[model samples]
Target: GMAEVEYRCFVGGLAWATTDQTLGEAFSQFGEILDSKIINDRETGRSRGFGFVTFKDEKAMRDAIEGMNGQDLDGRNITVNEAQSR
Candidate 1:
């Protein structure tokens, strides 16, 4: 099923300034973004330099990686990969 095939994506080398909107905007061009969340310090609200991005389809997920990985954003090279489940 398509639902079962969906992937949980992750991005590393995020800028400390990366925010939820920025993440959403970055990945939105490729496909439907189920959710985009930037991990941040609880007290300071500063990005932890990484984030999670969930996609509705594998094509979009792969496009996100190909389009954005190693691409400069907020002054840093990004790393995009499929997140593993625990």
Candidate 2:
């Protein structure tokens, strides 16, 4: 595997009420978080029930992904995986 990996992850299955800060806070337990935010609808500007988490290191990213996938945070089952660059 490439030693260089993206420090971001695609976080999905988020509940409507989950906030950017909440994701960061919840994600912080696993690693050093660079930032986190929920992606809102492009046109409607509403929570799309998905977002992303940026970690300071790939190590944290992997650990977070391992622990969080299928795990509920903010009372919602969440999905986590390495982000696919746009």
Candidate 3:
């Protein structure tokens, strides 16, 4: 059996106003989204200025990265690329 190929992207430069729904709406056009989340501050409950988007496959991930990188969302230019493992 072959393993599935999943791709996760890191998005940065998001405005404080950005939310999970807003972020998903922006990137969902590229492909099937497995998950989308914006990191929030535990104290202030504000956006951490970044997030992660997980795609079902690599193609979708690549498309999103190319199409959305440097694009403005919520008045901020977002950076899209592969998420680095912690």
Candidate 4:
């Protein structure tokens, strides 16, 4: 069966200042982002210091991981890898 494959990346070590818009902008250069989100603290409503970025395909996901991983974003090094699904 030909099933559609979607790609997603888990981004960690995010700066406290990081926002959903900033995260999306950073990865948008790689490809069409299916979605971008920064986890928020339920109590404080602040960033959880991590997020997830999803791409429409594998190439974009790989590109983002290669180009952005270990790079500084807002003075913090970010970790990018394929998101593991439960």
Candidate 5:
């Protein structure tokens, strides 16, 4: 079962070529990754340069922000921040 305190975060500055596997790999080191997804264009199925990461708990979420925010990946400077539900 998924952890209850998990939070979905928005990651920015991703290269257009980023993939779901790459996104998960990048964030897994920080904490328990419940889910990771890179939105893609419908036509091309390519990364949209942004994505969502869901952490299994608050600690993991914090660690991800501390560890990966401003980190470089795929030649891009990344930004990790909480995502708002719409």
Candidate 6:
């Protein structure tokens, strides 16, 4: 199923206390997430207030984009969109 699919998504406005585990867990409800995480500061241990969620299925990722966007996670509202290639 490695066809035309957006496998990853960008999740922003995360809480400072958010963790990769929790991030993955939150997106798990939408679909089968293959990867997920929260970014950290480069020169510090603080969270970067953003994260990413990836899914093995395209429908799940797209569905998550709509459902998860503007949704709250860890008691904080988050913004979700398609991730840009790096």
TM-scores for every candidate against the unseen true structure: 0.83, 0.83, 0.87, 0.85, 0.83, 0.85
At residue 47, candidate 1 shows an lDDT of 77
Give the clashing pairs for model 1: none
Candidate lDDT values, in order:
0.80, 0.82, 0.82, 0.82, 0.80, 0.82
Query: Model 1 lDDT vs. the true structure?
Result: 0.80
Highest TM-score model number:
3
Those runs of model 2 whose alpha carbons end farther than 4 Å from true positions after fitting are 1-6, 42-45, 84-86
Candidate RMSDs in Å, in order, are 2.2, 2.9, 2.6, 2.7, 2.8, 2.2
- Name the weakest run of 10 consecutive residues (lDDT summed) in model 3: 1-10
Q: Model 4 off-target regions past 4 Å?
A: 1-5, 84-86
lDDT of 1 by residue, 1-86 (tens): 25544466889889998887988888998777878889898788677999988887777787788788888767788888878431
Worst 10 residues of 2 by lDDT: 1-10
Tens digits of per-residue lDDT for model 3 on 1-86? 12235567899889899887899878899877878899998889888999988777777777898899999988899888877332
Q: How many backbone clashes does candidate 1 have?
A: 0
lDDT of 5 at 38: 91
1 against 4, candidate with superior TM-score: 4
Higher-ranked by TM-score: 4 or 5: 4
Error of 3 at 6 (Å): 3.3
Write model 4 residue lDDT over 1-86, tens digit each, in one string: 12235566899999988998999989998866878999988898778999988777777777889899899877799988778331
